[PDB]
């Protein structure tokens, strides 16, 4: 009672039921370094301007 598969049936993406737990770190990755924290707060004008040599603005 065997039926030959039709054209395009063996190439389907199927689903499988398994009791094997999904691995959590299959790449054996290290802990990622922490990023530079952030930019926060409101922007205020530069204190005393550019402060470049004699310029007061």
């Amino acid at each position: 009672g065997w039926v030959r598969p039709d054209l395009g049936e063996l190439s389907k993406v199927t689903k499988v039921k398994t009791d094997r737990p999904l691995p959590e770190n299959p790449y054996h990755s290290r802990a990622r370094p922490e990023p530079n924290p952030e930019a926060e707060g409101d922007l205020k004008p530069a204190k005393h301007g550019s402060r470049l040599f004699f310029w007061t603005m």
Binding site: N36, A39, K47, H48, R51
Partner: protein, 69 residues
């Protein structure tokens, strides 16, 4: 002559005080900025001197015709 062309000494005195305060603050800020620049360029942990790295969004996380990538 004093009444017509000149002010009292207090005006020049206190204007000098204000000018000195501004200039001293500017000098301190310049020294602080130089120190911050040195530290930021040495460590690379601040907003400045951030050099580009590869974007992680370019990686394809798909099965690769081989189980071991």
């Amino acid at each position: 002559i004093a009444r017509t062309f000149y002010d009292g000494p207090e005006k020049n005195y206190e204007k000098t005080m204000a000018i000195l305060q501004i200039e001293a603050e500017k000098a301190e800020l310049r020294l602080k900025e130089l120190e911050v620049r040195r530290l930021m360029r040495a460590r690379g942990d601040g907003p400045w001197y951030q050099y580009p790295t590869i974007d992680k969004a370019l990686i394809d996380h798909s099965p690769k015709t081989t189980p071991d990538n």
